[PDB]
Amino acid sequence: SFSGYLKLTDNVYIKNADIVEEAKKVKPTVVVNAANVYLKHGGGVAGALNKATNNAMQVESDDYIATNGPLKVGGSCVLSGHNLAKHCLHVVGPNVNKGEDIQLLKSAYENFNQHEVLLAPLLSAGIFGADPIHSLRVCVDTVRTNVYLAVFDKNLYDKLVSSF
Numbered sequence: 001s002f003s004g005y006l007k008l009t010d011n012v013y014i015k016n017a018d019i020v021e022e023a024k025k026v027k028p029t030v031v032v033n034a035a036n037v038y039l040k041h042g043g044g045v046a047g048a049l050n051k052a053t054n055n056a057m058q059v060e061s062d063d064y065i066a067t068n069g070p071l072k073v074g075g076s077c078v079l080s081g082h083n084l085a086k087h088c089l090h091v092v093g094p095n096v097n098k099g100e101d102i103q104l105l106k107s108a109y110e111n112f113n114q115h116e117v118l119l120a121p122l123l124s125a126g127i128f129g130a131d132p133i134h135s136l137r138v139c140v141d142t143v144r145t146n147v148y149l150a151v152f153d154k155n156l157y158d159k160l161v162s163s164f
């Protein structure tokens with residue numbers, strides 16, 4: 001079902017696309033959200049995915065937090081994918097702008113190994129403040145399952161590919 005991706009490794013693929021638009025087109029088994037520990041989906045990938053669900057992702061997430069408490073940085077939970085995917089894997093990468101340990105980025109990507117194929121963004125990059133070139137390297141060196149990476153910014157996509 002994935003189309004137009006550039007192969008980077010045996011198991012990692014990349015495309016210049018909004019992950020929301022790719023999810024609407026493909027309806028993958030799993031879409032990854034770039035979540036925070038409170039599952040407050042305000043902006044970046046999380047705010048865009050939640051808006052595409054008409055806020056249903058946020059209502060589900062608030063019930064999850066009321067029952068279970070916050071996630072750990074480096075942790076994840078599986079919730080519904082609503083109209084975008086069968087499931088959403090909410091993964092918390094460290095937020096560099098909040099001073100979180102960047103070594104937790106490898107722990108964050110290890111969550112992907114529980115799923116055979118995923119549509120995903122680069123964890124900890126974008127509004128989370130980490131270097132996206134570093135995030136792509138940790139992804140390729142950590143994830144063993146099949147990952148389709150969507151990168152919205154064209155200038156960044158070209159830099160990620162040309163420096164790989």
Ligand SMILES: CC(C)[C@H](CO)Nc1ncnc2[nH]ccc12
Pocket residue numbers: 017018019020044045048121122123125126127132150151152153156
């Ligand atoms: C995470 C970051 C490197 C990347 C830079 O374009 N942001 C995104 N990538 C893919 N789909 C997106 N929708 C909303 C944001 C967003």
